[PDB]
């Protein structure tokens, strides 16, 4: 569930969010951040298990 949630937020974040005379605003690192969050969560769940 957390893996799906983080991937969904990452994909939904790359679209630009400011418009008109200034464009872009899409954080390019979001996919690497989501892979980092899910891969550091994995260690905690393996310790619990």
């Amino acid at each position: 569930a957390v893996q799906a949630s983080r991937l969904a937020g990452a994909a939904a974040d790359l679209v630009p969010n400011i418009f008109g005379f200034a464009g872009g605003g899409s954080r390019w690192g979001a996919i690497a951040e989501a892979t980092g969050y899910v891969m550091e969560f994995s260690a905690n769940v393996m310790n619990t298990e």
């Binding site: 891969m39 550091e40 994995s42 260690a43 393996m46 310790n47 298990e49």
Partner: protein, 48 residues
């Protein structure tokens, strides 16, 4: 003769203790204990 019965039937208890401890020794780690070792060590490999 009754004293003989006392001795040999206490020996049956000593044998049950001896074989039970040997059964715990020869199979020292079961399928669950090493499963935790493998699972714990897999978490150590995510650092890179």
């Amino acid at each position: 003769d009754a004293e003989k019965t006392v001795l040999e039937k206490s020996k049956a208890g000593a044998q049950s203790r001896f074989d039970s401890y040997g059964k715990l020794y020869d199979e020292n780690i079961n399928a669950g204990e090493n499963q935790a070792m493998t699972l714990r060590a897999s978490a150590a490999g995510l650092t890179t």
